[PDB]
Amino acid sequence: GFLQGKKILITGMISERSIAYGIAKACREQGAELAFTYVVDKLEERVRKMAAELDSELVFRCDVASDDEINQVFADLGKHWDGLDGLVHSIGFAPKEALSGDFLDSISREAFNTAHEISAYSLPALAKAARPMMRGRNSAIVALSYLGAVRAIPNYNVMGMAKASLEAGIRFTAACLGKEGIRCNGISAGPIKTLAASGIADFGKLLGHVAAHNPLRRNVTIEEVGNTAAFLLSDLSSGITGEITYVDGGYSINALS
Amino acid sequence: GFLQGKKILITGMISERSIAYGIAKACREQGAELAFTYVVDKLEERVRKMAAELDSELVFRCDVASDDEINQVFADLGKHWDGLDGLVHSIGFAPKEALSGDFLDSISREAFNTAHEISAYSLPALAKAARPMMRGRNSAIVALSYLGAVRAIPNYNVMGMAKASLEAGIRFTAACLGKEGIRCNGISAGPIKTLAASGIADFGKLLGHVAAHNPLRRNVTIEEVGNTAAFLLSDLSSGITGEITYVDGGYSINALS
Amino acid sequence: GFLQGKKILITGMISERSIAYGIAKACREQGAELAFTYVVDKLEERVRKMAAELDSELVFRCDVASDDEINQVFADLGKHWDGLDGLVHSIGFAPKEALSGDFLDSISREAFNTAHEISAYSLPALAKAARPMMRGRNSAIVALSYLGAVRAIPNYNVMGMAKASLEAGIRFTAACLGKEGIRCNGISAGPIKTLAASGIADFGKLLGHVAAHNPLRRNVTIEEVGNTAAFLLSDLSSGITGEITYVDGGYSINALS
Amino acid sequence: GFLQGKKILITGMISERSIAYGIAKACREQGAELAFTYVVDKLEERVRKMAAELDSELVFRCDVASDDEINQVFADLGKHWDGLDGLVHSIGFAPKEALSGDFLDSISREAFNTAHEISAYSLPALAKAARPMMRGRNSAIVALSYLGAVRAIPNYNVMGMAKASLEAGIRFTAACLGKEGIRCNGISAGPIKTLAASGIADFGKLLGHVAAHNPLRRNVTIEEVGNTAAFLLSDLSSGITGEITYVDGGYSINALS
Ligand SMILES: NC(=O)c1ccc[n+]([C@@H]2O[C@H](COP(=O)([O-])OP(=O)(O)OC[C@H]3O[C@@H](n4cnc5c(N)ncnc54)[C@H](O)[C@@H]3O)[C@@H](O)[C@H]2O)c1
Ligand SMILES: NC(=O)c1ccc[n+]([C@@H]2O[C@H](COP(=O)([O-])OP(=O)(O)OC[C@H]3O[C@@H](n4cnc5c(N)ncnc54)[C@H](O)[C@@H]3O)[C@@H](O)[C@H]2O)c1
Ligand SMILES: NC(=O)c1ccc[n+]([C@@H]2O[C@H](COP(=O)([O-])OP(=O)(O)OC[C@H]3O[C@@H](n4cnc5c(N)ncnc54)[C@H](O)[C@@H]3O)[C@@H](O)[C@H]2O)c1
Ligand SMILES: NC(=O)c1ccc[n+]([C@@H]2O[C@H](COP(=O)([O-])OP(=O)(O)OC[C@H]3O[C@@H](n4cnc5c(N)ncnc54)[C@H](O)[C@@H]3O)[C@@H](O)[C@H]2O)c1
Ligand SMILES: Oc1cc(Cl)ccc1Oc1ccc(Cl)cc1Cl
Ligand SMILES: Oc1cc(Cl)ccc1Oc1ccc(Cl)cc1Cl
Ligand SMILES: Oc1cc(Cl)ccc1Oc1ccc(Cl)cc1Cl
Ligand SMILES: Oc1cc(Cl)ccc1Oc1ccc(Cl)cc1Cl
């Protein structure tokens, strides 16, 4: 197992459809020891149960809107773990009304701020809070992004701006932390039916177009995303930092198919 | 000239060193009629005086932190102009402390929020507010970005995340408005000594490195940026939308020089 | 006219549908003086006639397969002109059989070599031969490329590899010549029905998909490409080198529309 | 390991410094069965000896200048293996004189043709020749590229054009073969002292600049490149095709460091 001895904190696992669940399962299959966060109290039981199936009893509340909660996660986790080898950012949010229809009609200052704070700022915020536990460990951060960072896409709207901010965040974090032995990389995943995906108007059509038009002629799975994250969290990828890797069956590199 | 009679609103002109001044002068040279905004009352006289030299008496206060002020500009401008042919976004802000030293140490939630709101959200906010005046005119929007959008750069820090958000904003705005006959493009300018540039720690060294390492072996001018904006505002560029054009003397495409 | 006093050599003009014709017409409208090349003797009369309508009697044979013919163009042109301010590369070739159907089935060593030699090597070959006439003149080179450089596209096949080589050629030429006052830029044009376009199997479908899916919801014109080339050949673009500018109505920056 | 029983053909292994050696060792560590090619008879013994240390007695001559030799490899290999799961392209060549000094002065038609034929065409040529043995196996191809594909770099010169062609080749091969269950990906490696590296004028300074300026503040190893190739050859990367992955310690995403 190529993550033997790695201790990895995973955000964003709320169901077995979650990308973070695929990541968790892939990492555990490679021998990682896991810990998890959940955004609100209502989810605690569900997440503890999934964590238990993945051999973990380390679960912490963390709304990334809160610097106090972010910092408290690492304080609490630090009582159990000497250091942190892996950090998975698999979280995003924007108000549903901002992800439907005309980009300018649907945008607002408040939706823009929320989308960026939760979807983009949270990466440097978590990296910063994790830094004492991660530095010097030859450790790694993986964050999830989407093609909307670099292409205009119907309905994704302000989340595209937030993902672009996130990808730049990945690059700046990588440049910041590389000398102290922390890597930071992104996965730009193709569409996958998850709980959050239903917030994007006409998600079913995005999903269908990609399967019809990508080189693989099918959509990717949370196992495929998960195995890629596991690689990027492992010492196998020690030469790679500041990279965005596309796990979309080649969709982004194809045109007019 | 190739903007003869075109009516263009320009943000961000605060001195004769401003990129927006170079844009203004370039547009006026091609026959455009201009109007201007200024962030606070303390600048009104200075901006009115520059505007007068460019044959304009149309000057409006606009802090892009304020949706009221943004929308009031177009209400007031609309008393003079029956439509708007061009809109120039040449504005940015982040707290100076966030643009000095280690990326994660210098970042904060509040600095992130400010940087994104003023530097990135302001593009769709202005596009949205201008839309009734611009649509159906084969009109155009130009916004100013920087390499920090797509590369990690020392000291630019959180402004890089904001510029990435901005460039995605340009793409989404272009996709949104293209059917209505409004284009939206970006210029990624090389470093230029402007008032805002002094907010970046060690800007003088950044400026020097580019001149020593780009294909042209010199920095670009506000006239060069300005002429590019004039082109992108004109019907000559009617086949171009959602584009980021580098006016950095080739710096971005060079390595190891 | 922003090309007043500019002397520009244009390759590739074989009919009034040619991209090079749109370039020629756009440049002449801005006051440029023109000269032209043609690949074989059979075309001489047709090209001389088009050149005459554009106020030029300077027409030279040039098969870019031949170093002797390339060099002879500048020797001959140098009898009339003191220097050369603009050079337009608007030429490409690959055997038709290599641009139909399965990429690997259709490729061959010989087709690959031809495609690259004529479509890609010709840019540095012409730049190199033109260099004595262009250096120190604040002059400029523009070459035409296509999205196949950076995306896989059905049927374009080995021409995509040649266009990628070309775009790198543009970057290396820009880096090479920038200090001596020669710029080199590319235009990646959207699909346009030209003589050469019929060599691509199912070109009509490419053309239709782009018009249905790009931000402008229409294809671009040779006037739009031409006006962009005119800008890139003019002193207005003096801050820009090594750049690929997309004149495809935003097609490349849109996805899933 | 994650390549257990997978049969992988590796080109380009000429010494223990070779990138292909790092790939070979990484694949063998994950359980792969290997076979190898060598360019000329003079190398046969050296390569057989390295192959033996990696538990292989399958070694074949292959100068990729020769379509006969390329196709003969798979005919001969096919006597031992009923199919092929992995193919590694780790080969390049250009005349040394073309990789020294001014790009245009050093280039020639013949050097361009050689560089592209050996460095770029060889990827689709090998993919094409391997296709009967690879299809239907959920198999994979990996090829090695360099930053010169997408940035101008001193002295790398015409090899940059060839690498750009190669990367497009990777994209087109991926699009071509995806339905048949063959993936094709690239690794853009940072500088590593190998035999071929000495062909680049002033390679030692290039190597030094990267270590001084990348996020990791060091150069990558053939083990790091190798482990990445092993991942891209394995079913773990089944969601990834047509991708270029940077294993350069973040060099490409950094600027002005
Ligand atoms: N599903 C896809 O097609 C897809 C494609 C590309 C990228 N992504 C990205 O993958 C990541 C995971 O999304 P997913 O599709 O697995 O959806 P998901 O709904 O399974 O997970 C989204 C997670 O974000 C968390 N979250 C939201 N607001 C939060 C806050 N304030 N604090 C902490 N956590 C918060 C949610 O609780 C949830 O666990 C996201 O970044 C998403 O943008 C998804
Ligand atoms: N100077 C450079 O090297 C350079 C390079 C690339 C991009 N840019 C970008 O060019 C644009 C113009 O900056 P410049 O360098 O000409 O500097 P400048 O200081 O002349 O202009 C910056 C402008 O931003 C305006 N601004 C700041 N906060 C504002 C607010 N809340 N509301 C409205 N306006 C506000 C300022 O009043 C000022 O007019 C910016 O987007 C900057 O990021 C500059
Ligand atoms: N039409 C399009 O949709 C489109 C889109 C993007 C890029 N381009 C590019 O635009 C450029 C011009 O093509 P076009 O579409 O106007 O077609 P065109 O047929 O009008 O021009 C192609 C030209 O290439 C010339 N040529 C071919 N082999 C030559 C040789 N050995 N020596 C000298 N000249 C030679 C032809 O004689 C012809 O003049 C090409 O580089 C093409 O790849 C075209
Ligand atoms: N070393 C680096 O810094 C570096 C960085 C990025 C990419 N690369 C690429 O990695 C690959 C491997 O090179 P390396 O650096 O390991 O050097 P190397 O010298 O160990 O390997 C180069 C190989 O190319 C083979 N080759 C050359 N001409 C050939 C022909 N006609 N037919 C068949 N094989 C031929 C050589 O025999 C040799 O085995 C190349 O594609 C190179 O461009 C190298
Ligand atoms: O980023 C995503 C991209 C896709 Cl294709 C599908 C789901 C995604 O994830 C989200 C989408 C919308 C919201 Cl409000 C929150 C999240 Cl996490
Ligand atoms: O974005 C920029 C990039 C450069 Cl190289 C120089 C100046 C720039 O403009 C700014 C820099 C810092 C702040 Cl706080 C505000 C602005 Cl407008
Ligand atoms: O590059 C092109 C791209 C497009 Cl969409 C249309 C035409 C193009 O130009 C060519 C296509 C094929 C051949 Cl054989 C030669 C040339 Cl010049
Ligand atoms: O592509 C490369 C890039 C780097 Cl930084 C180092 C070595 C490389 O490999 C080569 C360099 C020159 C020649 Cl002639 C052949 C090969 Cl294989």
XYZ file of C-alpha atoms and ligand atoms in Angstrom, chain D residues 12-14 18-20 39 43 62-65 90-93 118 144-146 156 159 163 189-192 194-197 203, ligand 4:
76
model
C 15.252 4.852 -24.137
C 17.038 3.112 -21.262
C 20.768 3.574 -21.982
C 18.302 7.525 -17.918
C 14.795 8.690 -17.152
C 13.739 5.369 -18.692
C 18.750 2.229 -30.688
C 24.252 -0.741 -26.923
C 14.724 -0.133 -32.410
C 15.887 2.974 -34.195
C 12.680 5.013 -34.435
C 14.017 6.457 -37.690
C 11.533 8.083 -23.427
C 13.517 9.104 -26.469
C 14.656 12.216 -28.253
C 17.269 13.551 -30.630
C 12.895 11.275 -33.795
C 8.480 12.349 -21.824
C 8.381 16.045 -22.704
C 9.951 19.280 -21.495
C 16.816 24.191 -26.280
C 13.776 20.754 -29.523
C 8.283 18.805 -27.829
C 10.070 16.540 -16.391
C 12.357 19.118 -14.880
C 16.054 19.000 -15.792
C 18.023 15.897 -14.846
C 21.379 12.416 -18.296
C 23.544 11.499 -21.302
C 21.259 13.389 -23.721
C 21.213 16.487 -21.498
C 22.858 22.519 -19.445
N 17.070 14.764 -18.661
C 16.194 15.777 -18.644
O 16.419 16.798 -18.010
C 14.879 15.709 -19.380
C 13.871 16.604 -19.025
C 12.634 16.556 -19.677
C 12.444 15.617 -20.684
N 13.430 14.766 -21.020
C 13.145 13.797 -22.079
O 13.281 12.511 -21.488
C 13.465 11.574 -22.545
C 14.629 10.679 -22.192
O 15.884 11.385 -22.200
P 16.881 11.261 -20.954
O 17.087 12.674 -20.458
O 16.543 10.117 -20.059
O 18.280 10.996 -21.733
P 18.991 9.586 -22.098
O 20.153 10.033 -22.937
O 19.178 8.681 -20.914
O 17.877 8.948 -23.060
C 17.663 9.449 -24.371
C 17.321 8.201 -25.162
O 16.851 8.556 -26.455
C 17.247 7.494 -27.320
N 17.244 7.742 -28.765
C 17.876 8.752 -29.384
N 17.729 8.665 -30.710
C 16.991 7.567 -30.955
C 16.479 6.897 -32.159
N 16.689 7.358 -33.416
N 15.747 5.789 -31.960
C 15.486 5.266 -30.750
N 15.937 5.820 -29.609
C 16.681 6.954 -29.671
C 18.701 7.255 -26.873
O 19.366 6.063 -27.355
C 18.510 7.259 -25.378
O 18.225 5.932 -24.926
C 13.661 12.412 -23.793
O 12.406 12.490 -24.462
C 14.043 13.778 -23.288
O 13.729 14.807 -24.225
C 14.622 14.786 -20.397
